[PDB]
Amino acid sequence: STGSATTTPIDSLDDAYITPVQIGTPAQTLNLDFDTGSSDLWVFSSETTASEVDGQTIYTPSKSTTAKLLSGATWSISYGDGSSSSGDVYTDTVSVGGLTVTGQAVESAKKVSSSFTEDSTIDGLLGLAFSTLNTVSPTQQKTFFDNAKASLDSPVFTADLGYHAPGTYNFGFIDTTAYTGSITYTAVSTKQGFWEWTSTGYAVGSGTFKSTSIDGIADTGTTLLYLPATVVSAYWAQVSGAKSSSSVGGYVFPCSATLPSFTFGVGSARIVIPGDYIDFGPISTGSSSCFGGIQSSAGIGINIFGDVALKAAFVVFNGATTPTLGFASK
Numbered sequence: 417s418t419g420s421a422t423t424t425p426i427d428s429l430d431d432a433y434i435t436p437v438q439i440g441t442p443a444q445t446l447n448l449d450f451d452t453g454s455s456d457l458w459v460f461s462s463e464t465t466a467s468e469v470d471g472q473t474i475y476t477p478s479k480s481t482t483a484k485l486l487s488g489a490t491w492s493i494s495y496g497d498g499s500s501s502s503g504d505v506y507t508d509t510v511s512v513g514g515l516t517v518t519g520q521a522v523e524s525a526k527k528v529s530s531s532f533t534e535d536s537t538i539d540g541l542l543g544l545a546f547s548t549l550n551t552v553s554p555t556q557q558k559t560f561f562d563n564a565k566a567s568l569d570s571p572v573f574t575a576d577l578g579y580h581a582p583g584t585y586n587f588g589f590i591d592t593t594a595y596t597g598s599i600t601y602t603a604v605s606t607k608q609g610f611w612e613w614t615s616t617g618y619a620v621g622s623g624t625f626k627s628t629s630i631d632g633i634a635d636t637g638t639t640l641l642y643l644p645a646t647v648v649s650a651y652w653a654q655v656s657g658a659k660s661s662s663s664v665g666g667y668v669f670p671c672s673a674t675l676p677s678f679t680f681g682v683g684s685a686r687i688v689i690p691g692d693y694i695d696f697g698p699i700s701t702g703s704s705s706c707f708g709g710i711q712s713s714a715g716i717g718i719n720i721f722g723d724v725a726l727k728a729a730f731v732v733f734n735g736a737t738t739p740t741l742g743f744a745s746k
């Protein structure tokens with residue numbers, strides 16, 4: 417089997433991407449944030465505290481003839497930015513772009529934190545990291561990809577995120593028309609439950625490539641590119657007037673600037689992020705100071721190849737017995 421679904425930026429800055437997902441019988445379509453950095457499929461629901469729902473589409477399990485409460489099961493998650501959600505668990509039928517999983521754990525929110533309430537465009541998350549990170553207690557549950565993997569033509573999914581444009585998540589096959597050149601594969605450590613890999617280095621604009629190992633995670637659920645402070649300082653030094661602002665919480669730059677590209681290494685291959693991908697617009701409405709898309713990972717504890725990096729590539733998440741990650745230019 418295979419599946420294919422279009423993923424769409426939620427706003428003009430590509431702050432996140434949403435993908436339609438069919439849940440239950442008859443289908444209830446919710447737009448979920450596909451997140452290779454977490455392993456819970458959770459949704460706004462008829463059980464979510466009413467004051468915490470503000471425009472989201474909700475899952476109503478009582479209207480699904482295939483929904484079953486998973487007795488005694490609860491979930492609770494806290495994300496890297498301090499956002500959180502929690503609730504109970506149903507099993508139900510879940511389909512993505514024609515690919516169907518029966519018995520998928522659908523985590524129904526009773527509580528969500530304010531950042532989720534304030535984003536009317538995201539109806540929940542679909543986790544695509546490894547199932548060891550799933551938060552359901554007392555019995556951990558499997559991700560959508562884990563449940564589907566054995567049925568897929570190939571045990572893979574691919575992320576093709578667009579810049580200011582729609583893109584595609586494919587399950588079970590590699591669309592050889594979606595990229596240029598070859599796919600370079602690189603080793604993955606699953607010990608932290610992430611798609612964790614080691615970049616071979618970087619370059620800023622037309623500058624010299626610096627060979628240096630950068631351990632980090634491929635995370636479709638993080639907007640920006642978070643890299644070591646030395647790397648990020650070298651990038652923003654090439655942007656006249658850029659500075660790290662402690663009040664804003666990262667590097668800002670004059671909105672009139674033309675940003676240089678940023679290149680990262682995948683083995684001997686190179687992925688080039690165009691400068692425009694690194695512009696996240698005014699820090700506040702009407703300001704001429706703009707927020708940078710490459711930021712220091714010092715406060716995080718891990719480097720994150722988020723959407724800024726991944727949308728410059730066609731990315732293969734290979735879930736074979738020994739998982740690997742593939743990157744191609746496109």
Ligand SMILES: Cc1cccc(C)c1OCC(=O)N[C@@H](Cc1ccccc1)[C@@H](O)C[C@H](Cc1ccccc1)NC(=O)[C@H](C(C)C)N1CCCNC1=O
Nearest residue numbers: 451453454455494495496497499531549635637638639640
């Ligand atoms: C679940 C789990 C188990 C074990 C260990 C950890 C760290 C676990 O947490 C996983 C985790 O936080 N993953 C995040 C990136 C992560 C992995 C490991 C450590 C730290 C972080 C990321 O993919 C998911 C989450 C999605 C989200 C959150 C709030 C609103 C909307 C979307 N995204 C975010 O937190 C990011 C942060 C990092 C800037 N974020 C917040 C919104 C706006 N945009 C955005 O980019």
